[PDB]
Enzyme design. Sequence first.
Site, PDB file in Angstrom:
ATOM      1  N   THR A  96       2.650   1.997   4.197  1.00 33.87           N
ATOM      2  CA  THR A  96       3.544   3.120   4.472  1.00 33.87           C
ATOM      3  C   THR A  96       3.060   3.936   5.670  1.00 33.87           C
ATOM      4  OG1 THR A  96       2.420   4.656   2.966  1.00 33.87           O
ATOM      5  CG2 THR A  96       4.065   3.257   1.989  1.00 33.87           C
TER       6      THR A  96
ATOM      7  N   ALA B 207       0.817  -1.206   0.000  1.00 28.21           N
ATOM      8  CA  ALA B 207       0.000   0.000   0.000  1.00 28.21           C
ATOM      9  C   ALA B 207       0.855   1.262   0.000  1.00 28.21           C
ATOM     10  CB  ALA B 207      -0.939   0.004   1.197  1.00 28.21           C
ATOM     11  N   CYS B 208       0.647   2.101  -1.010  1.00 23.58           N
ATOM     12  CA  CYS B 208       1.398   3.344  -1.141  1.00 23.58           C
ATOM     13  C   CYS B 208       0.571   4.411  -1.851  1.00 23.58           C
ATOM     14  CB  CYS B 208       2.703   3.103  -1.906  1.00 23.58           C
ATOM     15  SG  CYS B 208       4.098   4.090  -1.320  1.00 23.58           S
ATOM     16  N   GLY B 209       0.105   4.086  -3.051  1.00 23.46           N
ATOM     17  CA  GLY B 209      -0.694   5.027  -3.816  1.00 23.46           C
ATOM     18  C   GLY B 209      -0.793   4.647  -5.281  1.00 23.46           C
TER      19      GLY B 209
END
Length: 113
Positions: free
Chosen positions: A76, A27-29
């Site tokens: 993150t 998960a980051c974007g």
Amino acid sequence: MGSSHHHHHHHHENLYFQGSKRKIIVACGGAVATSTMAAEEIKELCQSHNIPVELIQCRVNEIETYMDGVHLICTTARVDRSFGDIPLVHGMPFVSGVGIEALQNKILTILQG
């Protein structure tokens, strides 16, 4: 010739390899070089030692919903990791692009047990 059996046309079937052993989430974007770095890095490593697994990507609020069969989670700094036993971790140093080499060794050390 056998009560409906043996297809000469083609056996177009769909395999279910949505397991293998373990499934991790990222998960980051979207895509800012950081994502492409991890995916490729984690992929090359996973294959380096021949570790069959499936790497999935998700937003800051998706791992929970897609947490059906995940063996490890990578967020993150967002989730609390205090619900149940969601094996998640934060790649804070991994994003640095400098502390990966040293951290990598640590990850493998525990990944192997």
